Amino acid sequence: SLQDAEWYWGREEVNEKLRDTADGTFLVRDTKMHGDYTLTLRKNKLIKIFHRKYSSVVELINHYRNESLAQYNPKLDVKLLYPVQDQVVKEDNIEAVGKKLHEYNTQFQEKSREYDRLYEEYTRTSQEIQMKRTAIEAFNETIKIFEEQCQTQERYSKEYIEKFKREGNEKEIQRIMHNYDKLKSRISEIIDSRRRLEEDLKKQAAEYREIDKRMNSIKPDLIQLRKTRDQYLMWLTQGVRQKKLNEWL
């Protein structure tokens, strides 16, 4: 009973069992010339158990499952609420629990690639998007310089029509208007270049949302697929066979 004790396992692998449990979840651990047992309550708060009384290790913990730890030490207004082999299809097979550990671990490892793929697509897309955004400010700036140019030429060219005029009246002004015509339909091209970027930007940001959307639907399954796979590996280690595991995994 004191060796079994449910929560009594008997540092690093304690954290991974306390990882992602709620506020109040706990367990008890075992240098002996230091202290004896260690209550690891998550809020990870470590509380010593000295033995010289502790009447027993099980005696002290059942009291504080009912009652908080505030009266003992000021800033611990939290109880030992969650004292964490339940499901696992109850398979008392040993071999077939071992096969399921491969099955779920192939599914988990399959799922982690899909998650890793999409986190790259996401960040490439966040890059590709903002590259387009800057390009649009570049186009828009490019266009100002061309819009300024067709303006800049009108000031000087329509001075050089009126003054003189008769001196090559079309011989001059044809080849001034030709340049002006090339200038403005060039602007027409630049603008239609820019417009066409912005249509892609929304089509990119569309895909960007669709990546994130499926990341958030791959995540919750990935957490429980991992969590089920860990209890399937707990259930086994409750024959030792530390070395046999690796072929399944």
Partner: protein, 1059 residues
């Protein structure tokens, strides 16, 4: 079909279905010479907008200079109308919109059309606008940085502008040290002495000296240049450069027409005119250290070499130094307030709405905002809000109530929030804010927070280690919110106020009475404690950072806090035992830390990780560095100190001012300070911060800016070239690819850009002309470039006629970078503590997003090659002996005996490091042996056992010694396992393992400081916990040894005895 039970997979298809098949090289993308095209066409048309308003397009060659183009433009503008409206071409300058969307005026008209980063191929002509042409060489700065400087000027944030103006304090203060004893101290900034930490010498180095003497060689030149004269000395190891310079002159100028005394007077006039160079690279011996203390000497001893120094005239040196010439830039708490300790209310925070949330309604049921206050760890019960308006348009208009009084908020307090899905608990996004601003002002009013996506390794809900601040990227969940406004901007208490409230809190404790259960808080011991406690406190002190402290031990520590001053090294543990949610305690802690005893830098660096965010603490930590941390020991740990900047709350802080100043005092620091900052500029967590800091550096670093601008330009050339090779020239033969490479590199823009410049791996080494015949693309799928340069030194011959270094686009170098750093630190730890294991921590430098440089080690081969070249006729099996046979073929005589010693010394070092760090499994193609017999590992992959993230108490052995290695270790004997040759080898490994076990605090902290960098292998502290098991820190060393012996026995299957 009976293989598969006829069970089809309908979904599967192979009409191009992934980057599994031919699976390598994912860094993309980044655009090159023009918008949307990597490499501009060799003959291109460019619009030339004139002042008269005329557009003339003229075909230019891609590589044509602006002087060439202007000169032709004003010939071709004659044939267009309104020619009389143009001035002379000299009254004009080019400008255009660049790829960064700014309109860069092109002042340096020697630049080529391809090198301009033009976006659209067009140029506009204008008369030079700003009267200070000089002032608008922030292009230099913004080219070095990679974002244009003007981009800061239109930032609104008062902090950023306050950083930019205030940090100049440091820049001016640095330059003022440089031009103090010029030209000497300038030469000292440029060519700082490359020197070990210790003058004291290891016994194994000393024993190569025959009673403290080396044979040196001094070289000199006379007429015209090019004829050189040896002057081989035999000086004391611990004599200074000046003394070595005299001897060379003595022996140069002894003569049969010179009396003894006549020589002595010729020595004095000559002696002060020279200083010692290293032949073959820009290194020098510029101050009084023992020769042995300079790195070059100490390496020359180890490799069994005769140092080759040059006698260099000080004026031929002070020739080559320029004027650093600093220039202040264009850019040259208002009213009273209500102290935080006056505010008589709890904390509450109004969570309004998140907008841009992308979730499946079919998958997820309900979503909510989790929140919490933090200090690294949390000052209260973590609360949520209710699960209201699920998935579709989520809008809660709730005040969250946190059980903490506003006065008990610490200066370094931070709200860490996250939107989650529902036990289906699962984070969507996250983001944190500092509860105070950089001017100490408690944050009130309305705030909008653009969030960050959850990274790979995080299963947790909240992520408080993550960066404080909003996301720059707009298209992300913008969770906006409101903070309680108290009819006055609430500021944080002064230190003078905290001192008084502390000094009161003390005297108030002095009258608390007889019995106090939960003594924990206060001592009840008086001036006399018990000896058993004072023994227990040093036991706590010794325990590493990751051995978490109990609530008992915490309180025990916090009570005896005043005795804890006698054991300074406890401070990290003490600080973690403060109740930061009790200002009474925190006020008292500020008084201890104010005048706490300085501690050693390797212990004070713990205080700059994410578990110690308080300004007062981090101050003390930088105070520790300013005292002890030498310029040598700084650059050892520079990677860790740049990463630790991320955990500072504000731009403007004591650490940034420390590092910045050092970088401007020492150009070897500056050089790597630039490149680690520049490396991370792609990462939007820090783009803003590091740009600002890189501006500060670039503006104050003197002429090295112009050197860095060449290095930068040379890397960008290579980044394109490889990016072309990895996209369009994939699915080609090497033959075809290499024909493309050599074509490109011969063009003049490549010939200009890749030739005369400094290696970023070590700016001592110059890179001269490219030797293209020895330049080539490697066989790797990533298309790395094997690049080769002529060492243009005077004494190329004496050091290496060819420098050569690998450039690898598409592979994240910073994991390798760190392990190679850890190896370099393990080596120094062993060797400086007298035991000569020989690691080869080759050079590696990441310069960007999965782009970097790797030192070539000449004359070394993969075990695989050793076996390929030694494979006999018909392809049956490879011989175990061929390594041994190949090593003998290179080392014959007494040389053989020494080669095995080296092999066995390098095999023992690399076994222990590898096992401890848990680096990727070792095998034939990632292990390398050199002609002289030293072995070393390459391509480390994942350091702290990142493949345990699938399944994982594996405590793996990555270097497993096949027979091949043991044959070589024990000369040739059958059953190698049982010789004295191997007994030795084992005892090297045990002594090595115990050395790294007694320096475990350091290595923990190095990894702790690297959490900042988003390395998937370092996501949070229990990643770093692997190094505890592998070192066995919870056990006693006698068990630890046996643990290692055990761990080693089972991997090798027999051979590891009691001893």
């Amino acid at each position: 079909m009976s293989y598969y039970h006829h069970h089809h997979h309908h979904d599967y298809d192979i009409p191009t279905t992934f980057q599994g098949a031919m699976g390598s090289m994912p860094p993309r993308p980044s655009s090159g010479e023009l918008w949307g095209i990597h490499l501009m066409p060799p003959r291109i048309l460019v619009e030339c907008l004139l002042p008269n308003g005329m557009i003339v397009t003229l075909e230019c060659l891609r590589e044509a200079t602006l002087i060439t183009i202007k000169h032709e433009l004003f010939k071709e503008a004659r044939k267009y109308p309104l020619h009389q409206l143009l001035q002379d071409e000299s009254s004009y300058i080019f400008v255009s919109v660049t790829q960064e969307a700014e309109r860069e005026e092109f002042f340096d008209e020697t630049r080529r059309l391809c090198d301009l980063r033009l976006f659209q191929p067009f140029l506009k002509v204008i008369e030079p606008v700003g009267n200070r042409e000089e002032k608008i060489l922030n292009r230099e700065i913004g080219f070095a940085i990679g974002m244009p400087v003007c981009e800061f000027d239109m930032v609104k944030d008062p902090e950023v502008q306050d950083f930019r103006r205030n940090i100049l304090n440091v820049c001016k203060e640095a330059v003022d040290l440089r031009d103090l004893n010029s030209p000497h101290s300038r030469a000292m900034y440029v060519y700082p002495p490359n020197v070990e930490s210790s003058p004291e010498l290891p016994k194994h180095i000393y024993n190569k000296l025959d009673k403290g003497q080396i044979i040196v060689v001094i070289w000199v030149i006379v007429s015209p240049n090019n004829d050189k004269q040896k002057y081989t000395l035999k000086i004391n190891h611990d004599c200074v450069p000046e003394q070595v310079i005299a001897e060379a002159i003595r022996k140069k100028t002894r003569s049969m027409l010179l009396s003894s005394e006549q020589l002595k007077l010729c020595v004095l006039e000559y002696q002060g005119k020279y200083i010692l160079k290293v032949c073959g690279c820009d290194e020098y011996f510029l101050e009084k250290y023992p020769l042995s203390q300079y790195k070059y000497i100490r390496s020359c001893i180890m490799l069994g070499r005769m140092p080759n120094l040059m006698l260099m005239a000080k004026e031929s040196l002070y020739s080559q130094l320029p004027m650093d010439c600093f220039t202040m830039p264009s850019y040259s708490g208002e009213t009273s307030t209500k102290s935080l300790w006056v505010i008589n209310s709890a904390l509450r925070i109004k969570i309004l709405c998140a907008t841009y949330v992308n979730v499946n309604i079919r998958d997820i049921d309900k979503i909510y905002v989790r929140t919490g206050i933090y200090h690294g760890g949390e000052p209260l019960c973590d609360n949520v809000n209710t699960q209201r308006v699920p998935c579709s348009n989520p809008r809660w208009n709730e005040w969250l109530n946190y059980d903490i009084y506003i006065p008990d908020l610490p200066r370094a307090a931070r709200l860490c929030l996250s939107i989650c899905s529902v036990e289906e608990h699962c984070p969507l996004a996250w983001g944190n804010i500092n509860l105070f601003d950089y001017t100490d002002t408690l944050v009130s009013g309305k705030m909008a927070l653009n969030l960050w996506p959850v990274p790979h390794g995080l299963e947790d809900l909240l992520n408080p280690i993550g960066v404080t601040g909003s996301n720059p990227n707009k298209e992300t969940p913008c969770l906006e919110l409101e903070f309680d406004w108290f009819s006055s901007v609430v500021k944080f208490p002064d230190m003078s106020v905290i001192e008084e409230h502390a000094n009161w809190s003390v005297s108030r404790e002095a009258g608390f009475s007889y019995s106090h259960a939960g003594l924990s808080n206060r001592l009840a011991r008086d001036n006399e404690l018990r000896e058993n406690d004072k023994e227990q406190l040093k036991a706590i002190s010794t325990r590493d950072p990751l051995s978490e402290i109990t609530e008992q031990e915490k309180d025990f520590l916090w009570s005896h806090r005043h005795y804890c001053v006698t054991i300074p090294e406890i401070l990290p543990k003490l600080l973690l035992s403060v109740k930061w949610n009790s200002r009474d305690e925190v006020a008292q802690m500020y008084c201890l830390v104010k005048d706490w005893p300085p501690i050693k830098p390797e212990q004070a660096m713990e205080l700059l990780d994410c578990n110690y965010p308080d300004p007062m603490v981090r101050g003390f930590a930088v105070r520790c560095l300013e005292k002890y941390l030498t310029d040598d020991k700084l650059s050892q740990y520079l990677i860790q100190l740049v990463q630790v900047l991320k955990y500072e709350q504000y731009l403007d802080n004591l650490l940034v001012r420390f590092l910045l100043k050092k970088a401007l005092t020492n150009q070897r620091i500056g050089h790597f300070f630039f490149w680690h900052l520049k490396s991370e500029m792609h990462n939007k967590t820090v783009s803003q911060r590091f740009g600002l800091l890189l501006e500060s550096y670039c503006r104050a670093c003197g002429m090295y800016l112009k050197h860095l601008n060449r290095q930068v330009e040379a890397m960008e050339k290579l980044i394109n070239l490889t990016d072309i090779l990895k996209q369009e020239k994939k699915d080609e033969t090497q033959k075809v690819q290499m024909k493309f490479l050599v074509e490109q590199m011969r063009r003049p823009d490549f010939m200009d850009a890749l030739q005369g410049f400094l290696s970023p791996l070590n700016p001592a080494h110059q890179l001269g002309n490219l030797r293209l015949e020895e330049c080539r693309i490697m066989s790797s799928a990533k298309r790395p470039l094997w690049l080769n340069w002529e060492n243009p030194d005077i004494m190329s011959e004496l050091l290496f006629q060819n420098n050569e270094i690998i450039f690898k686009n598409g592979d994240d170098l910073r994991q390798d970078m760190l392990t190679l750093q850890i190896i370099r630190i393990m080596e120094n730890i062993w060797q400086n503590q007298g035991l000569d294991l020989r690691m080869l921590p080759y050079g590696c430098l990441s310069i960007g997003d999965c782009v970097g440089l790797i030192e070539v080690v000449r004359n070394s081969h993969t075990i695989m090659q050793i076996q390929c070249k030694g494979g006999l006729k018909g392809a049956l099996q490879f011989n175990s002996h061929t390594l041994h046979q190949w090593l003998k073929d290179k080392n014959k005589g007494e040389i053989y005996d020494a080669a095995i010693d080296l092999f066995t010394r390098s095999c023992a070092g690399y076994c222990v490091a590898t096992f401890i760090l848990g680096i990727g499994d070792r095998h034939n193609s990632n292990i390398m042996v050199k002609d002289d017999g030293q072995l070393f590992h390459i391509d480390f992959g994942h350091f702290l056992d990142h493949k345990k993230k699938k399944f994982g108490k594996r405590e793996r052995v990555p270097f497993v010694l096949t027979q091949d290695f043991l044959i070589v270790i024990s000369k040739g004997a059958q059953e190698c396992t049982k010789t004295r040759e191997f007994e030795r080898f084992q005892e090297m490994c045990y002594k090595a393992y115990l050395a790294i076990r007694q320096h475990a605090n350091l290595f923990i902290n190095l990894f702790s400081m690297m959490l900042g960098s988003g390395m998937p292998e370092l996501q949070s502290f229990d990643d770093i916990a692997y190094i505890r098991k592998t070192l066995a820190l919870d056990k006693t060393e006698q068990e630890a040894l046996e643990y290692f012996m055990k761990q080693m026995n089972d991997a090798h299957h027999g051979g590891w005895t009691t001893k």
